[PDB]
Amino acid sequence: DVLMTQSPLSLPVSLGDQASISCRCSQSIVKSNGHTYLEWYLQKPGRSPKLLIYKVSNRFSGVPDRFSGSGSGTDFTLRISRVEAEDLGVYYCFQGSHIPWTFGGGTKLESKRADAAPTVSIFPPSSEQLTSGGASVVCFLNNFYPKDINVKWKIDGSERQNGVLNSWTDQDSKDSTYSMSSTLTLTKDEYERHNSYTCEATHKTSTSPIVKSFNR
């Protein structure tokens, strides 16, 4: 099988600029007839892949001139100039030269914007949940940029890195910010043994620590 490797994984550009996505092969994708059947697809969230470039460097129907593909042997590039908002999504390369046909990992094209500190809210467990023998402490970190941020949990001043589940949203298409929820799962009995619950967002780097606490 021909292994396609794409790099980078994510790539933030300012709208109007140029982007370069690379796609490497673990062996030749020249077919017996001498032709290279490399294709680039774009996939937007919720929708299915749309064919952009076929056969290394041919624009498909209704694909704007700003997309151009090139490359030689095991190395293939997709350059996107004048990046518009509708160009944002995931870019896969594909080879139709040898069975099985394989895809690359993909590369996320995201948009750059101005730095924004998160809005942080911490929630105690609901009394409903306590009647079930569980206690989930929840923390929302909303509308920040960039994607990377460090969330710290503290219970009675002591750091907790244990049963913590974090989930990010996709880049918000209206304002280009990211959001995150961070959940601390405890038993009801563990919860009652402790008073102070704190959720820390940190950027260093940026806007100094944002702490949010509750007690009882």
């Binding site: 076929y54 056969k55 959001s179 929820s181 959940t183």
Partner: protein, 225 residues
């Protein structure tokens, strides 16, 4: 327009079977080779099966050969995928795509795709979600904005729908991708509303779970102490 629509996906226990179905419209179906392509939770795309226009020639990768059978019916304009002895590795969104015309020449494979049907192969039993209100604690500093939430915990399988006030509230809403918490999915949703409009006005989160035929409405009530 040329159109392709999948169907037949659902939940099955490992080792079981299922049959996927793809309808074609707006083109001469028998002239085109057809494939199935799957997308994994990781986002990886994998070619899975191909059949010629005439039905005579099929091909599979080694990961599915012997287990999957691509089939078509040109008279009815249908493409099928007979799946058997499924394993958790087969969980993916299954796409239906046309590659090439049987008449020369040969370029651009997969130009039209379906919307995809979801297969999930798991032994984890179907479980409706627990829905919990997320309200600020009765001591928290309050600003011009107030953020509330809903925590939707321990359900299976995907998906679940979350809306706020029957959908009439869509501003400042963040719903977060579900995460596996050992054979059960957990998800939370967040809404931010003007300080005045709560609790003087009522905020309710609505959660539907198709697979368990369950809908839950939860009012976000200020916590007293």
């Amino acid at each position: 327009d040329v159109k392709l629509v999948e169907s037949g996906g659902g939940l099955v226990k490992p080792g079981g079977s299922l049959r996927l179905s793809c309808a074609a419209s707006g083109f001469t179906f028998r002239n085109y080779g057809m494939s199935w392509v799957r997308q994994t939770p990781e986002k990886r795309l994998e070619w899975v099966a191909a059949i010629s226009g005439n039905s005579l020639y099929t091909s599979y990768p080694d990961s599915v050969k012997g287990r999957f059978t691509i089939s078509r019916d040109n008279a009815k304009n249908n493409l099928y995928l007979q799946m058997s002895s499924l394993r958790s590795e087969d969980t993916a969104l299954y796409f239906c795509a046309r590659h090439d015309d049987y008449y020369g020449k040969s370029p651009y494979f997969f130009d039209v795709w379906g919307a995809g049907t979801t297969v999930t192969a798991s032994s984890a039993k179907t479980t409706p979600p627990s829905v919990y209100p997320l309200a600020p604690g009765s001591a928290a500093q309050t600003n011009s904005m107030v953020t509330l939430g809903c925590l939707v915990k321990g359900y299976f399988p995907e998906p679940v729908t979350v809306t706020w006030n029957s959908g009439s509230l869509s501003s400042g809403v963040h719903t977060f991708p579900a995460v596996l918490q050992s054979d059960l999915y957990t998800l939370s949703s967040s809404v931010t509303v003007p300080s005045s409009t709560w609790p003087s006005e009522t905020v309710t989160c609505n959660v539907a779970h198709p697979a368990s035929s369950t809908k839950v409405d939860k009012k976000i009530v200020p916590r007293d102490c």
